[PDB]
Amino acid sequence: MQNPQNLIWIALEMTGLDPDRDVIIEMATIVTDSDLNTLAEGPVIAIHQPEEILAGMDEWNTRQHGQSGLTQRVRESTVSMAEAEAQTLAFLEQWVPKRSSPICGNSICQDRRFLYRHMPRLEGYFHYRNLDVSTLKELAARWAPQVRESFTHLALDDIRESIAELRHYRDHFIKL
Amino acid sequence: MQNPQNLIWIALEMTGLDPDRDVIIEMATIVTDSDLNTLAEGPVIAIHQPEEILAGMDEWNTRQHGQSGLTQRVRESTVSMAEAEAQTLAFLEQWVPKRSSPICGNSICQDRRFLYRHMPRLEGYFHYRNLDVSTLKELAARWAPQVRESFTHLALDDIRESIAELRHYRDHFIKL
């Protein structure tokens, strides 16, 4: 089951853009193999936060997490940050050994920074490498401008879209 | 002269790897066009730091920056963190518009962390995306190992090698 070549894909939602001042309010994970085939989907967790944190979000986050239903899910959740971290680690441990996988997704530097502050045990579970699908997005936009046009509010859909985007580049942008 | 397609490459030296404990002590930039041709090399700035900050460095950093001469350059420098940020912004503004270029280089999530904390105006001048060559290296390691295998003491050589590493992957790992 564990395989050091498997990939951990993660997507977070936050109350804001500052990893040190804002907090995580949703997380989800998916594990693929090294050739991007989905092995298992992880839990989608809304992380409880006090009401003043929800009220303090800026106008974009207030509207977006409001109409997605996440704000209400956060208020109703009884899962703390630490419980969400432990639940996610308990899933990932079945599929990927410690320190093996890069953190995989779109602009996952932002996600790693939030994990380092708020879920450092989970952050430390990753290899130090980042696998950033948006690096390839930027290169394709400049070098193959319509490989980019040949190619999501639910968490697992967002991650599936990131895996699909990398599959698209492996097939039409990368020379294997 | 400004072109929203131009890429900003950056390299930093720090007293250590933790932005809460450590500070930037050297910075350098290079601007390329979208096809990795040098347009201009920016200033290489040693950033002054008081002696207790220089004393507060651990063993590996105290030795590595002492031996390279950076510590002495920092002790002597009359350029503050804010002035170095302004000097670098004055250069980049001649070539790239605001919020257009991602941060380009290797291990540039760590750079973004330091810029966010210590040079927020320069950090905000970049597009929020990262163009990390190590994403390509990780993919080549899994999917085309011979390309990774078939491929920096001073700041401008250090950046130029990162540009040469991307160029290598464009020529042997990207199909165009």
Number of helices of chain A: 8
CATH topology of chain A: Nucleotidyltransferase, domain 5
Question: What portion of the residues of chain A fall into strands of 2 or more residues?
Answer: 15-25%
Following the backbone from N to C, one meets helices and strands of chain A in this order, namely EEEEHHHHEHHEHH
Q: Name the CATH architecture of chain A.
A: 2-Layer Sandwich
Largest sheet of chain A: 6 strands, mixed
Q: Please tell me the total number of domains of chain A.
A: 1
The CATH homologous superfamily of chain A is named: Ribonuclease H-like superfamily/Ribonuclease H
InterPro entries (chains A, B): Exonuclease_RNaseT/DNA_pol3 (IPR013520), Oligoribonuclease (IPR022894), RNaseH-like_sf (IPR012337), RNaseH_sf (IPR036397)
Protein name (chains A, B): Oligoribonuclease
Domain Exonuclease (chains A, B): 7-166
Subcellular location (chains A, B): Cytoplasm
Give a nutshell description of this structure.
The structure holds 2 chains of a larger assembly. Chain A starts with 6 loop residues before the first strand and ends with a helix.
Note down, in words, how this protein is organized.
The structure holds 2 chains of a larger assembly. Chain A is of the alpha/beta class and 176 residues long. The first copy, chain A, has eight helices and six strands; from the N terminus they run E-E-E-E-H-H-H-H-E-H-H-E-H-H. Chain A has helices at 51-55, 59-68, 70-76, 81-92, 108-118, 120-123, 133-143, 155-172; strands spanning 7-14, 24-32, 38-41, 45-46, 103-105, 130-132. In chain A, strands 1, 2, 3, 4, 5 and 6 form a six-stranded mixed sheet that branches. In chain A, helix 7 (133-143) packs across helix 8 (155-172). The PDB classes it as hydrolase. The entry lists the keywords PaOrn, Oligoribonuclease, Pseudomonas aeruginosa., hydrolase. The entry is titled "PaOrn Oligoribonuclease D11A mutant with RNA GU complex structure". Chains A, B are Oligoribonuclease.
